Amino acid sequence: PKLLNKFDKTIKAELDAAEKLRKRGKIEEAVNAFKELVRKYPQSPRARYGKAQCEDDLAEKRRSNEVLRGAIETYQEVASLPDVPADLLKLSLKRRSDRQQFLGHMRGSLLTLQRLVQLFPNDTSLKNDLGVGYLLIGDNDNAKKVYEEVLSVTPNDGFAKVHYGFILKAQNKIAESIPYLKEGIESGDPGTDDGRFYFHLGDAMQRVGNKEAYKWYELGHKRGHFASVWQRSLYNVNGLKAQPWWTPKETGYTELVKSLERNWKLIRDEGLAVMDKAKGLFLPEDENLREKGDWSQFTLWQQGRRNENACKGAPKTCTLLEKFPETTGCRRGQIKYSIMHPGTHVWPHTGPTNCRLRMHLGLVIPKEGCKIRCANETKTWEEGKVLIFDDSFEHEVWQDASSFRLIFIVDVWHPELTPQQRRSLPAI
Amino acid sequence: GKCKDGLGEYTCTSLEGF
Ligand SMILES: O=C(O)CCC(=O)C(=O)O
Ligand SMILES: [Fe+3]
């Protein structure tokens, strides 16, 4: 990596002295040393890069977003200096975009990545990075065009294949996504050994009836992406008791279960009132989990946050549930009514995290036709009775009754999570 | 988009620095 232009070669002794302070962990002295070099040599690209790297390390030491914001600006200043070597220009702007994403400045990172691609039009890795920038902001349409451009010049780029396959799957192009996800994973290219691609390749195969799906789940488990073949969540705390079905006593949330079962009719009645008089509060399931049928959910809490307008629609239920912070404070779960109508098949799927357990309270259960499988075990609901399962295990639902089926879904923190963990885990 | 019931988003958590 050639990082020194002609001028920087003449001051290499001063640059090496400053960088040695950084390598020895004397970040404050290194910051000041590079600051002096920037003052004395304001056009040195290596002095400016050294200043940004020191600010970067200082932000890590101090855990400071603001210090990192200063480094992000200094990385940009490197790019505007005269005679900047190409390797240094790429390194500086790449780190700038990386740190912008870390801070959540997704629009800023996208502008930096666009600049990089314009400066280095033949660097396909930079285009791949640009596609990731679009994916992080939710712009799957532009991400898809980026990876199409990469695959047109390098058809066997494994990184581009898995991301193109990921986008196809997210768009419900199930059959189309399989060879991209499969060949991309099989390429072994850097960035393809990722649980997200194992997850969706196996799921795409399950949807088309490809029995090879569980061979890929087993491989993802062997490579450390899944806790097991059945439990395939990707946002996990390791060591939590892993079990498809739970009894109330096993969870320890027996007071919550008793309150739900004793008061189930008021929960039902408010749910039916919303069905009859405010049915627009039930929103269709929107995560492509249905093969067919009608399935809607009316959410009272999400990410540990109460929906005030939703609780105006079920005020007694929200008043009841507020007494239980083990569910209202579950920032990795929800509290929601779930209605499902005959002719519905929910694809086998898993939730995103092993940090929650999922309770189902039966409210209106037809006498026949409704059942739920979790792992290798299938059960049914009962009106006024709670079922508890770990939805980080693969689960699947059928509704073949002759009338609607209404349940109440209550997520709780996994009981083995300490209060310190329940407070620090990012919301999902 | 949020990962409420599934794992369909590219990332399910938000990025907010340290
Ligand atoms: O039966 C239902 O309404 C939803 C089943 C499901 O996939 C879940 O509760 O996670
Ligand atoms: Fe589910």
How many Å from the N-terminal Cα to the C-terminal Cα in chain A? 40
What pairing do the DSSP bridges indicate for beta strands A305-306 and A295-302?
A: antiparallel
**Cβ contacts of A322 within 8 Å, gap of 6 or more:** A306, A328
A167, A145 in Cβ contact below 8 A? no
Give distance in angstroms: CA of A164 to centre of ligand 1.
Answer: 29
Secondary structure element (H or E) that encloses residue A370, with its range: strand A370-374
Q: How far is CA A84 from CA A10, A98, A424, in A?
A: 15, 20, 42
Give distance in angstroms: CA of A360 to centre of ligand 1.
Answer: 8
Report the alpha-carbon distance of residue A132 to residue A235 in Å, rounded: 19
A181, A197 in Cβ contact below 8 A? yes
Other Cβ atoms closer than 10 A to A152? 9
Give distance in angstroms: CA of A358 to centre of ligand 2.
Answer: 9
Contacts of B18 in chain A (CB under 8 A): 59, 63-65, 68
A352's tokens: 């995103």
A361 close to ligand 1 (CB < 6 Angstrom): no
Sequence length of chain B is 18
A71's tokens: 């480094």
Task: Pick the residue whose CA is nearest to atom 3 on ligand 1.
Answer: A338
A250, A240 in Cβ contact below 8 A? no
A97's tokens: 């975009």
Nearest-Cα distance to chain A for B10, in Å, is 6
Contact B10 A289 (CB under 8 A): no
A219 touches chain B (CB under 8 A): no
Of A332, A292, A412, A327, residue with least CA distance to B3: A332
What pairing do the DSSP bridges indicate for beta strands A386-389 and A245-246?
A: antiparallel
Interface residue of B2, B3, B4 to substitute, partner A, most A CBs within 10 Å: B4
Q: How far is CA A187 from CA A153, A161, A176, A213, A395, in A?
A: 17, 9, 18, 18, 30
Helix axes A65-80, A45-62, angle to 10 degrees: 170
Contact A287 B10 (CB under 8 A): no
A181, A162 in Cβ contact below 8 A? yes
Contact B10 A349 (CB under 8 A): no
In b/e form, how buried is each residue of A287-316, taking b as 16+ CB within 10 angstroms?
A: bbbbeebebbbbbbbbebeebeebbebbee
Nearest-Cα distance to chain B for A76, in Å, is 19
Amino acid sitting at position A183:
E
Other Cβ atoms closer than 10 A to A51? 27
Half-sphere exposure of A364 (CA within 13 A, CB side): 19
What is the number of the ligand 1 atom nearest to the C-alpha of A407?
3
According to CATH, the topology of domain A245-424 is Jelly Rolls (2.60.120)
What sign results for the dihedral spanned by CA atoms A149, A154, A159, A164? Answer: positive
Contact B7 A428 (CB under 8 A): no
Q: For residue A319, which phi and psi values (nearest 5 degrees)?
A: -60, -40
Classify domain A6-222 by CATH number.
1.25.40.10
Interface residue of B5, B9, B12, B15 to substitute, partner A, most A CBs within 10 Å: B5
- Experimental approach was X-ray
Report the alpha-carbon distance of residue A347 to residue A375 in Å, rounded: 13
Amino acid sitting at position A142:
N
Nearest-Cα distance to chain A for B17, in Å, is 4
B15, A132 in Cβ contact below 8 A? no
Secondary structure element (H or E) that encloses residue A331, with its range: none
A7 touches chain B (CB under 8 A): no
Q: What is the DSSP letter of A25?
A: T
What is the separation of C-alpha A167 from the centre of its chain, rounded to a whole number of angstroms? 14
Of A237, A243, A258, residue with least CA distance to A324: A258
Long-range contacts of A142-149 (CB under 8 A, 24+ apart): A143/A167
Report the alpha-carbon distance of residue A120 to residue A124 in Å, rounded: 9
Report the alpha-carbon distance of residue A263 to residue A247 in Å, rounded: 19
Nearest chain B alpha carbon to A349: B6
Q: What is the DSSP letter of A231?
A: B
List, as residue ranges, the binding site of A for Fe cation.
Answer: 349, 395
Domain residue extents for chain A = 6-222, 245-424
Q: Residue A296: beta bridge partners?
A: A284, A339
Residue that is written with structure tokens 């569910």 in the block: A327
Angle, alpha carbons A336-A369-A233 (nearest 5°): 45
Contacts of A285 in chain B (CB under 8 A): 5
A332, A427 in Cβ contact below 8 A? yes
What sign results for the dihedral spanned by CA atoms A179, A181, A182, A185? Answer: positive
Of A287, A359, A363, residue with least CA distance to A330: A359
Report the alpha-carbon distance of residue A294 to residue A182 in Å, rounded: 31
Q: Chain A 97-156, CB below 8 Å of chain B: which residues? A: 101-104, 106, 135-136, 138
Of A155, A95, A146, A144, residue with least CA distance to A121: A146
How many Å from the N-terminal Cα to the C-terminal Cα in chain B? 23
Q: How far is CA A73 from CA A77, A99, A345, in A?
A: 6, 11, 51
A392, A332 in Cβ contact below 8 A? no
What is the number of the ligand 1 atom nearest to the C-alpha of A360?
9
Q: How far is CA A385 from CA A140, A168, A320, A382, B10, in A?
A: 42, 40, 17, 5, 36
Three-state SS letters, A153-219: HCCCCHHHHHHHHHHHHHCCCHHHHHHHHHHHHHHCCCCCCCHHHHHHHHHHHHHHCCCCHHHHHHH
Nearest-Cα distance to chain A for B8, in Å, is 6
A63 touches chain B (CB under 8 A): yes
Residue A283 burial (CB < 10 Å; 0-12/13-18/19+)? exposed
Of A203, A210, A157, A144, residue with least CA distance to A351: A203
Report the alpha-carbon distance of residue A181 to residue A161 in Å, rounded: 6
Strand A290-292: give its sheet, edge to edge: A290-292, A344-349, A395-399, A370-374, A377-379
A75, A103 in Cβ contact below 8 A? no
What is the separation of C-alpha A401 from the centre of its chain, rounded to a whole number of angstroms? 35
Q: What is the DSSP letter of A411?
A: E
Sequence length of chain A is 428
Other Cβ atoms closer than 10 A to A201? 29
- The answer to whether the A6-222 and A245-424 domains have the same CATH topology is no
